[PDB]
From Swiss-Prot:
<comment type="function">
    <text>Phosphatidylinositol (PtdIns) phosphatase that specifically hydrolyzes the 5-phosphate of phosphatidylinositol-3,4,5-trisphosphate (PtdIns(3,4,5)P3) to produce PtdIns(3,4)P2, thereby negatively regulating the PI3K (phosphoinositide 3-kinase) pathways. Able also to hydrolyzes the 5-phosphate of phosphatidylinositol-4,5-bisphosphate (PtdIns(4,5)P3) and inositol 1,3,4,5-tetrakisphosphate. Acts as a negative regulator of B-cell antigen receptor signaling.</text>
</comment>
<comment type="similarity">
    <text>Belongs to the inositol 1,4,5-trisphosphate 5-phosphatase family.</text>
</comment>
<protein>
    <recommendedName>
        <fullName>Phosphatidylinositol 3,4,5-trisphosphate 5-phosphatase 1</fullName>
    </recommendedName>
</protein>
<comment type="subunit">
    <text>Interacts with tyrosine phosphorylated form of SHC1. Interacts with tyrosine phosphorylated form of DOK1. Interacts with tyrosine phosphorylated form of DOK3. Interacts with tyrosine phosphorylated form of SLAMF1/CD150. Interacts with PTPN11 in response to IL-3. Interacts with receptor EPOR. Interacts with receptors MS4A2/FCER1B and FCER1G. Interacts with receptors FCGR2B and FCGR3. Interacts with receptor FCGR2A, leading to regulate gene expression during the phagocytic process. Interacts with GRB2. Interacts with PLCG1. Interacts with tyrosine kinases SRC and TEC. Interacts with c-Met/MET.</text>
</comment>
Length: 460
C-alpha cells in the first residue's frame, strides 16, 4: 500500500448564527453552490482530511460530530476518524480523516487564543489544530475576529495576537510562530472584514450582487485592501472570490441581505460582505493548489452562508535510511555562501542565525555576523562564508530536495528573534552555488530579508 505524495484537504468555515443547522448540509462538503465549485464527477471521492471551522456554534461537540460524520458517510460511504476537536466558547474546529490515514497522523496539537482585553475579551479568538501527516506538518486555524465595518485595525491586531500566541506544532521551533511551523498552514474563519462602501450604497451593492458583478465590491473588501497594504496576512494566499458576499442574510432564504441597523446589531449596518474566508501559506516550492472556493446556496439557518475550499497538497513519506534517522549521512551537506541579512531594526547588537529543520538532528547556531550600514539607512548583517556546514540526517536527494530550512536571526544581547524565514532545498541543481532568498518576519510583520547562495550535496 504506497504512501501518498498528494492529499486533498477540505476546509469549511461557517458562522452558524447560534442556530442549529438544517437536516442536510452535504452541499458544503461537496463544494456545491456559488464560486469555484467542485465537479459532480468527484462527489463520491472522499477528501483525505476534512477541517470544519464553525463560529457562533450552538451545538455540543458530540452533536456536531454526529452531524459531520453522518454527512460524510452519506456522501462517501466512508466512516471518518476524528483526529481532533477543540472549542473556545462558540468557536470550534473539527478535523476528520479517512480511516486509512489513522496511523499516518501523529503529534496532534490543539490550542486556542482569546483576543482583546476586558470589554473585548469574552467571545472572539481562534482555535487551531496541527499534526504530522507522514513527513508533512499541517496546521489549521479557525478564527472569529472582531466584528464591525469600522474595526479592521482591531481585526489585524486579533490576527497578530492569534499568530503570536497560538501554540501549535513543534515546540522545539522556539523562534517560530505558526506562520513558519507548518508545511501547509490553513487559516480560515469569520474573519469579519467588510466591503467598505458608504452605507447609502447598500441597495447599489445588493444590485451588483444580483448581477454577479463583484469587481467593484472586491476592490473595497477590507481583507484584500489590508493584505495589499501588508497590514495583515502577509505571505498568505487566497483564491479569487467568485461567490456572492456570505453575510448578512435574512435567515431561511438567501434572497435577502439584511443590512440595516437594528438594536440587535448595536445600531450598526452590515453591508454585504465576504466575512467568511479561507487563506493558506505553504513552504516555498511545495505543491498546493486550490481546487474549490465558494459558498453554499441551500443552507439558510444562519445569517452567514457556509464557505468551502479544497486543496491538493503535496505530502512526503516518513523517510528511513540505513544512516538517519539516529545519525547523520556524511554524503549530505548544506553550505551557505555570501549570505547576509538586511534588517529594518534601528538597534545595534550583534546577530547570529539559527537553522532549524527536521532534516537536522537539532538546530544549528551560527557565529555572529558582521554589521555594516546599508546605503539607504539599513542594518546589513554579513555572514560571508562563515556559516556552519549543515549535516542532514539523510543524504538521499528524494528526501533532501523536499526539505526546508527555517532561519531565525537572533540578537546576541537578548537571544530574541528579529526575523524568521524559510528556504526550500528544492533546488535547480546540487553541488552548484545557487541564489537563495527569504523575507524575514517577526510577529508576522516584515522585518528584513535574508539572501545569499546555497550549495547542496546529496548522495547523487
Ligand atoms: O487517536 C486519535 C486520532 O487518531 C487519528 F485518527 F488521528 N485520537 C484519540 C484521542 C481523542 C481524539 C479526538 C478523537 C484523537
Amino acid at each position: 500500500q504506497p504512501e501518498p505524495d498528494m492529499i486533498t484537504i477540505f476546509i469549511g468555515t461557517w458562522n452558524m448564527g447560534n442556530a442549529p443547522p438544517p437536516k442536510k448540509i452535504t452541499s458544503w462538503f461537496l463544494s456545491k453552490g456559488q464560486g469555484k465549485t467542485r465537479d459532480d464527477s468527484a462527489d463520491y471521492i472522499p477528501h483525505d482530511i476534512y477541517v470544519i471551522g464553525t463560529q457562533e456554534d450552538p451545538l455540543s461537540e458530540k452533536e456536531w460530530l454526529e452531524i459531520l460524520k453522518h454527512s460524510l458517510q452519506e456522501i462517501t460511504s466512508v466512516t471518518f476518524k476524528t483526529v481532533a476537536i477543540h472549542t473556545l466558547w462558540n468557536i470550534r474546529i473539527v478535523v476528520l480523516a479517512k480511516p486509512e490515514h489513522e496511523n499516518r497522523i501523529s503529534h496532534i496539537c490543539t490550542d486556542n487564543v482569546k483576543t482583546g482585553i476586558a470589554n473585548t475579551l469574552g467571545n472572539k479568538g481562534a482555535v487551531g489544530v496541527s499534526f504530522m501527516f507522514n513527513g508533512t506538518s499541517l496546521g489549521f486555524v479557525n478564527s472569529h475576529l472582531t466584528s464591525g465595518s469600522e474595526k479592521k485595525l482591531r481585526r489585524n491586531q486579533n490576527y497578530m495576537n492569534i499568530l503570536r500566541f497560538l501554540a501549535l506544532g513543534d515546540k522545539k521551533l522556539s523562534p517560530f510562530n505558526i506562520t513558519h511551523r507548518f508545511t501547509h498552514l490553513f487559516w480560515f474563519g469569520d474573519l469579519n472584514y467588510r466591503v467598505d462602501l458608504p452605507t447609502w450604497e447598500a441597495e447599489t451593492i445588493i444590485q451588483k450582487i444580483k448581477q454577479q458583478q463583484y469587481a467593484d465590491l472586491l476592490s473595497h473588501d477590507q481583507l484584500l485592501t489590508e493584505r495589499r497594504e501588508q497590514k495583515v496576512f502577509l505571505h498568505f494566499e487566497e483564491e479569487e472570490i467568485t461567490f456572492a458576499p456570505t453575510y448578512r442574510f435574512e435567515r431561511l432564504t438567501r434572497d435577502k441581505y439584511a443590512y440595516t441597523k437594528q438594536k440587535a446589531t448595536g445600531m450598526k449596518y452590515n453591508l454585504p460582505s465576504w466575512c467568511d474566508r479561507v487563506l493558506w501559506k505553504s513552504y516555498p516550492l511545495v505543491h498546493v493548489v486550490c481546487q474549490s472556493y465558494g459558498s453554499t446556496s441551500d443552507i439558510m439557518t444562519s445569517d452567514h452562508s457556509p464557505v468551502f475550499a479544497t486543496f491538493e497538497a503535496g505530502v512526503t513519506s516518513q523517510f528511513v535510511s540505513k544512516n538517519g534517522p539516529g545519525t547523520v549521512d556524511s554524503q549530505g551537506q548544506i553550505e551557505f555562501l555570501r549570505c547576509y541579512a538586511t534588517l529594518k531594526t534601528k538597534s545595534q547588537t550583534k546577530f547570529y542565525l539559527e537553522f532549524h529543520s527536521s532534516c537536522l538532528e537539532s538546530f544549528v547556531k551560527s557565529q555572529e555576523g558582521e554589521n555594516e550600514e546599508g546605503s539607504e539607512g539599513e542594518l546589513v548583517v554579513k555572514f560571508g562564508e562563515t556559516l556552519p556546514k549543515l549535516k542532514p540526517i539523510i543524504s538521499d536527494p528524494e528526501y533532501l530536495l523536499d526539505q526546508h530550512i527555517l532561519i531565525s536571526i537572533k540578537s546576541s544581547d537578548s537571544d530574541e528573534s528579529y526575523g524568521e524565514g524559510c528556504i526550500a532545498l528544492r533546488l535547480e541543481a546540487t553541488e552548484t552555488q545557487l541564489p537563495i532568498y527569504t523575507p524575514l518576519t517577526h510577529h508576522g510583520e516584515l522585518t528584513g530579508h535574508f539572501q545569499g547562495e546555497i550549495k547542496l550535496q546529496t548522495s547523487q
